[PDB]
């Protein structure tokens, strides 16, 4: 049930990423919930993926 | 926007905090009216058993 505020923002002028070095443009989306449970699991999706 | 929202997060959360210094103020009341109860009883003790002291004298 994503219900939580959205912290948005377009990175461009990229640079070479840490895992792939790709030269790739960013854009961050941002949901936090303040569930404990629902932050590790949030963690291991987001991490895992 | 957004900032307003937990800016309403925030106002509950002072709310809660508000209601656990309400409780702990109940809590310090509670605990000085214990010392005030057992000081009533135990003047009437040593009341009337002095008084007995009294007659029994």
């Known amino acids: 049930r994503g219900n939580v505020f959205l912290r948005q923002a377009e990175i461009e002028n990229p640079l070479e990423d840490p895992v792939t070095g790709d030269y790739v443009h960013k854009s961050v989306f941002i949901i936090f919930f303040q569930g404990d449970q629902l932050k590790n699991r949030v963690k291991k999706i987001c991490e895992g993926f | 926007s957004q900032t307003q ?3 309403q997060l925030l106002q509950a959360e002072k709310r809660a905090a508000e209601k656990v210094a309400d409780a702990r103020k109940r ?9 005030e109860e057992a000081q009533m009883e135990v ?6 058993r002095e008084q007995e002291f009294q007659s029994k004298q």
Do not use: C, D, T, W
């Open chain 2, 43 to 48: 003047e009437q003790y040593r009341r009337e």
């Open chain 2, 5 to 7: 929202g937990i800016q």
């Open chain 2, 27 to 35: 809590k310090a009341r509670r605990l000085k009216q214990a010392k």
